[PDB]
């Protein structure tokens, strides 16, 4: 399915994933798109935050779902 990812900056990303896909796999796909390191990411969806390992299915995340992505608490 094609899920969207809205950043806290002002941009969206259309990533093609599936239900069996692991949140970890997603974070990786993002790092390839932009350049943000996994150890520095925060995905939130209608419900709560997506933990590593689990699959997009666990969070019943369907297609066209907006994933609120936020960077770690830093400064620069």
């Amino acid at each position: 399915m094609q899920i969207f990812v809205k950043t806290l900056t002002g941009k969206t990303i259309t990533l093609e994933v599936e239900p069996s896909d692991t949140i970890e796999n997603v974070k990786a796909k993002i790092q390839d798109k932009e350049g943000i390191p996994p150890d520095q990411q925060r995905l939130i969806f209608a419900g709560k935050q997506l933990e590593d390992g689990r699959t997009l299915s666990d969070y019943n995340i369907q297609k066209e779902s907006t994933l609120h992505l936020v960077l770690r608490l830093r400064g620069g």
């Binding site: 950043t7 806290l8 900056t9 935050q49 609120h68 936020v70 960077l71 770690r72 608490l73 400064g75």
Partner: protein, 131 residues
């Protein structure tokens, strides 16, 4: 009386007032959320930027400020500054923009009913409030 501090930040605010330089920010942000040094000169700084980026809101900002209300961390100390901080998050935007609406959605998506007080502040303002 008035702490020479205000006088200091005041000068800086009028210094790089009209200068979208990614430098000042690259220094203020950290000192505002570098996850280390105290939170003293931090709070003030946070406001300094708000004044400048009062209009055009950047990302690295709402990101750190947000990752704060949640993780907070910057806990090295505590006293009274959540007032000025929350205020910024409000004026952080121009005013009329559903952008804020989305933000609130994030704060609601996550637990931590402590920031509730804030949810009522920003909420009451902008949309969803007046009648």
């Amino acid at each position: 009386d008035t702490k020479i501090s205000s006088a200091a930040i005041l000068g800086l605010g009028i210094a790089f007032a009209g200068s979208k330089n990614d430098e000042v920010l690259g220094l203020l942000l950290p000192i505002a959320a570098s996850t280390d040094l105290p939170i003293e000169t931090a709070a003030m700084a946070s406001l300094a930027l708000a004044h400048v980026f009062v209009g055009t809101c950047n990302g690295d900002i709402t990101t750190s400020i947000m990752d704060n209300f949640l993780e907070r961390t910057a806990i090295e100390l505590k006293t009274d500054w959540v007032r000025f901080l929350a205020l910024a998050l409000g004026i952080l935007y121009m005013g009329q923009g559903e952008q804020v609406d989305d933000v609130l959605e994030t704060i609601s998506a996550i637990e931590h009913p402590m920031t509730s007080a804030i949810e009522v502040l920003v909420g009451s303002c902008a949309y969803t409030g007046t009648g």
